[PDB]
Amino acid sequence: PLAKDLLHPSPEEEKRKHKKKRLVQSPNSYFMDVKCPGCYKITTVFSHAQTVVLCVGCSTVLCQPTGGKARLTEGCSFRRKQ
Amino acid sequence: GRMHAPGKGLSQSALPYRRSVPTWLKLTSDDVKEQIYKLAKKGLTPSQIGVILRDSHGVAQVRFVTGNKILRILKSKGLAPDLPEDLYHLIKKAVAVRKHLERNRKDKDAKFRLILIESRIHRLARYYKTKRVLPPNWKYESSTASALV
Amino acid sequence: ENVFGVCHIFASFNDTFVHVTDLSGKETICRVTGGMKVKADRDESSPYAAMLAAQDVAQRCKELGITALHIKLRATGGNRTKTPGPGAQSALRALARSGMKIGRIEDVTPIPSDST
Amino acid sequence: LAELLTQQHGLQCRATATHTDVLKDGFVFRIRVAYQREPQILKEVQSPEGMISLRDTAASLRLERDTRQLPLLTSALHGLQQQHPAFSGVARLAKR
Amino acid sequence: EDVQGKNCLTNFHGMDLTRDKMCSMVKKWQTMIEAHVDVKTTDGYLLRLFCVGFTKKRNNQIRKTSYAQHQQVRQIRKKMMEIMTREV
Amino acid sequence: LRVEVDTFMEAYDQKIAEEEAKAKEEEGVPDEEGWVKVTRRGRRPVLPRTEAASLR
Amino acid sequence: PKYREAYLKECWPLVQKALNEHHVNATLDLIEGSMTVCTTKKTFDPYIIIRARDLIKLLARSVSFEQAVRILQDDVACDIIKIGSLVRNKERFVKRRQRLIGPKGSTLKALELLTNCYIMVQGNTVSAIGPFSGLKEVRKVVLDTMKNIHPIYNIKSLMIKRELAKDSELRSQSWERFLPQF
RNA sequence: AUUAAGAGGGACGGCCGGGGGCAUUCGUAUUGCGCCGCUAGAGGUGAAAUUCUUGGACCGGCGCAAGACGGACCAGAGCGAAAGCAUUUGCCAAGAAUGUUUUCAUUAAUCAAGAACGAACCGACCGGCGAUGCGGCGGCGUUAUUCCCAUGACCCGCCGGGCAGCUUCCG
Ligand SMILES: [Mg+2]
Ligand SMILES: [Mg+2]
Ligand SMILES: [Mg+2]
Ligand SMILES: [Mg+2]
Ligand SMILES: [Mg+2]
Ligand SMILES: [Mg+2]
Ligand SMILES: [Zn+2]
């Protein structure tokens, strides 16, 4: 087999492995800022959301829960956080 | 290593190394607690309360922000559930299967599935008795189970 | 133009039937089997017996003005064989020898879908 | 449609932006070509707040009547005359 | 239906597809979906129609099997019933 | 009539083509302040901004 | 089938030559994976297309070209027997199919000599070509093996039927006693 | 007491399957019956013989009824603890895997006894390569398109858990 150093894996190796099989566990989900159309208030939404997200100001449906990542509505703008 | 399934699943949550709250989080420890109280007053399970906070308010972990677990916070305010959540959900499943099984005499599979659910109920009941959550006289009866939940 | 008919040729290993009806197949014109021509049970399905059966029917259609035939070749079907009998070829050939015009040929052997 | 009709069957056809008039056997017919999703397109109303909705419109209602509702009744009443031959006389006398 | 003095006047009674053509379409590495509907015409005629379809392999496809899942088959079947119903 | 129909159709199509060509350049490509615009032209299906879909 | 596409491609020039003698056209459609036979106006024999239909069916069943075109002669007929539906169990079907061919193909060859018919076992079908009396015997014996009666009984039965044939006497008299009994 | 196990239990999300139960429905074949047309035979064999026929057998047409069965599509594919599971639609309950920065916090494994169900070379021996079935992630391009219903088909890379092959390594 190809030689791999367990102490210093390359960045592309550890990004490819399963989240539980890395040296240290690290989730692949994240939080994002979404700006709905109609009113430009900013809402924080989890990427793998399981519930419909409604704007606090205008009560517009932002995202729909799916099997994996939540699907956003058309016309929205999203920013990865951190 | 599922108890009643030969396959071994690996799908689960993996917590990050960091235990510190994010800088963007504009909610305080006190503010989150009243959101928990309002969701509980609506009639939501603590597992479901954590889901709502994660999805909309950006609360990745309630324990990291407030310093206490969700169930411990609810007990302090007095919003303590009558029965443990996992036990209550398991008893709820048994009643629904039993109710269906009365109208379908020939359903052998539902009979077999009923045994497995009752086996988990008995095992969990003994463990909770050891932890003194339940009084040492609580028993699970098929007729009583409907009144229990 | 041509006056058309429908010719049913059942070709079993035991016997050969040639049967001619109208276009709808409900009115019978002429029907001769292999047993009518040969006075022996061995040769009822023989090709020679079928040739005599075809010749008798073919001349009968002539006096009625029938000039062309449609052909339905059929075997015993069912659980048994789906191969046309020996009488199928000679009776088919003899029909063309008499001058009968040949239209379309089609196999109407009953083919089961679910085995018994 | 008018160009092909006069070439293949030698019929007098006049092309208009909304219809085609065809003369056959002494009768004059007016042919209208319709598109299925056109009433849906007429119902598109983008709102100022930023949402595109579907609302009924007088123009949208009119096109649905001439191309969908009107042919149905004409076909429905035509079949009724077959069972009752006296329907035609009563209706025409009623209009008169 | 009626006879008018040496002129048998007929009407449509039914329709069917030939055996050889029917056998030829049914191939081995594809899925076949079938449906049937009972629809009454405007003039009172009641009909039963049968429809059959086969999945198509794409030009650039490399996978040898072109198979449709169960829900896609039912969705295909549901559209087939609605179209035949509406067109009669 | 044919010339005007052709001319209106001749004028119409580049505007559709110009919008498509402009959209394909703008797909992805986050701008300043890091906003990314959700479009139908990506590979992930997205919820349409329609009243009917919102009620569903 | 797909595995038959390769063989048919090189032997297609030959079969079109064979059919052109009787003025019947054939086409090997590669995309659809089908073989099609159709008559023409030059053809004068109506029955040859029925024989032409049989030829393409045998080739689809992996029958060799030399044996396949042999049925074009009037004296030879053909019969394809489907045996897959007989047994639900696949393991039983494989075992009884192997019993039919026998050790080294002896039982298959012994049946082939007695019947004077060419028999080939491929997949869930057995293809037989030869005289009409022969094809009747093959269907009786081959179907019988799937019914869990050993082939050696019918093969030995055919041999005893053969020896009585040479005997001119007692032809009218029944052979029930002479036939072997369990 | 702390953490939240590539230990386990539960909830949540969209899917998936000849898994099970209740109704519902269609399809040929075969058999029997009713009527019409025609007239000496039909069936079976190696050859015959039992049988059916002028009160019409067999064959050709139309319709009705009954009992089974569910081809081709159908694959070393899928599902179920095993035995086992194949037309359509509606209903009831259950489940695997995947996704999860959700929840509880050791609640676990193997097992005589006991209980439910039950046709008719060798060893947890690290790995690799191709396909294949389901779920998810990312992508240059084609192909359709969404009133409702619906958001896919194909190609490429990657992650898991399965059904199996070809190979190696260790005891
Ligand atoms: Mg899970
Ligand atoms: Mg864990
Ligand atoms: Mg679930
Ligand atoms: Mg389902
Ligand atoms: Mg299902
Ligand atoms: Mg996939
Ligand atoms: Zn808003």
Taken as a percent bin, the fraction of beta residues of chain A is 25-35%
Estimate percent helicity of chain C: 25-40%
Give the structural class of chain A.
mainly beta
Within CATH, the superfamily of chain A carries the name: Ribosomal protein S27
**Largest sheet entry of chain C:** 5 strands, mixed
CATH topology category name of chain A: N-terminal domain of TfIIb
The portion of residues forming beta strands of chain C comes to: 25-35%
Number of domains in the coordinates of chain A? Answer: 1
What is the N-to-C succession of helices and strands of chain A?
Answer: HEEEEEE
Radius of gyration of chain C, whole Å = 14 Å
The span between the termini of chain A is: 38 Å
> Mind describing the biggest β-sheet of chain A?
3 strands, antiparallel
Any guess at the CATH architecture of chain C? 2-Layer Sandwich
| Class from helix and strand fractions of chain C | alpha/beta
With strands numbered from the N-terminus, the spatial order across the biggest sheet of chain A is 2-1-6
Task: Kindly provide the radius of gyration of chain A, computed on alpha-carbon positions and rounded to a whole number of angstroms.
Answer: 18 Å
Q: Quaternary arrangement of the chains shown?
A: part of a larger assembly
Number of extended strands of chain C: 5
Spell out the CATH superfamily of chain C. Answer: Ribosomal protein S11/S14
Helix/strand layout:
This is part of a larger assembly, with seven protein chains of seven kinds.
Chain B: H1 29-41, H2 46-56, H3 62-66, H4 70-77, H5 85-103, H6 108-130, H7 142-148
Helix pairs in contact in B: 1-4, 5-6, 5-7
Chain F: H1 2-26, E1 36-37, H2 51-55
Chain G: H1 5-20, E1 24-29, E2 34-39, H2 48-60, H3 65-68, E3 77-82, H4 90-101, H5 106-115, E4 118-122, E5 125-130, H6 132-146, H7 151-166
Antiparallel strand pairs in G: 1-2, 3-5, 4-5
The structure holds magnesium ion (MG) (6 copies) and zinc ion.
One magnesium ion is lined by residues 9, 11 of chain B.
The structure holds one RNA strand of 171 nucleotides.
Keywords (chain C): Cytoplasm, Isopeptide bond, Nucleus, Phosphoprotein, Ribonucleoprotein, Ribosomal protein, Ubl conjugation
Cross-link (Glycyl lysine isopeptide (Lys-Gly) (interchain with G-Cter in SUMO2)) (chain C): 37, 39, 82
Family (chain C): Belongs to the universal ribosomal protein uS11 family.
